[PDB]
Amino acid sequence: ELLKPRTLADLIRILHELFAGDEVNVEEVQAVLEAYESNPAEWALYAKFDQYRYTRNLVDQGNGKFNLMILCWGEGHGSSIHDHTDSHAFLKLLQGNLKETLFDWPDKKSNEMIKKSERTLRENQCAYINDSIGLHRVENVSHTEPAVSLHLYSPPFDTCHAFDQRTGHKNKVTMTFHSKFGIRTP
């Protein structure tokens, strides 16, 4: 029974209930993420930016079932084209706008990865992806506004692949946390 999360803390409690089992009701998880109205005071602790690239800030470890984290995107910061390691990936905007570009899985043959579609994700919107859907790139193309997003991955993963847009070739990447539970983790 899904109720509106009143606060980020409330959201986290609700997520623990929704991931208490072995499976994931994606539509319910997306609905509750969308229903949380971003309150910057509640996540300022996690919103640690870097001048040169986007940062990943761990918020909750989900009792082992998921990682919940906040990503902070300076102006012009963006991601690789990447997958999600056979996991569920939810993305909710907390501040600003991000451009999500969708790509298909490349064929064995070397070829330009042509974008399938793109959308602008706006404050409080929640997107979902998984490997059966495809790949994506996420970018803050703003020249004037930093962006902040809330990501939920289930099961947790700390490795993924980056794809070369020119060829489709992939390379394994290990993701690091800029901070955990509000604490910078150099």
Ligand X SMILES: N[C@@H](CCS)C(=O)O
Q: Residue ranges for the binding site for Fe cation?
A: 82, 84, 136
Closest CB to ligand X among 6 and 165? 165
d(CA 71, CA 60): 13
CB of 1 to ligand X, least distance (A): 28
Residue 45: DSSP 8-state: G
The residue among 91 and 126 lying less far from ligand X, judged by its C-beta, is: 91
Specify the residue, 11 or 89, whose C-beta has the smaller distance to ligand X. 89
State the minimum distance, in angstroms, from the CB of residue 8 to ligand X: 18
Put residue 108 in one of left, alpha, beta given phi > 0 → left and psi -120 to 50 → alpha: alpha
Annotated binding site: 82, 84, 136
Structure-token match 């803050």, residue found? 140
How far is residue 50's CA from residue 31's CA, in Å, rounded to a whole number?
30
CB of residue 185 to ligand X, shortest distance in Å = 15
Residue placing its CB nearer to ligand X in the complex, 144 or 159: 159
Binding site for ligand X (CB under 6 A): 56, 79, 89, 91, 138, 151, 175
Phi, psi of 27 (to 5 degrees): -70, -40
Q: Quote the CA–CA distance of 31 and 94 in Å, as a whole number.
A: 15
For the CB of residue 22, give the shortest distance to ligand X in the complex, in Å: 23
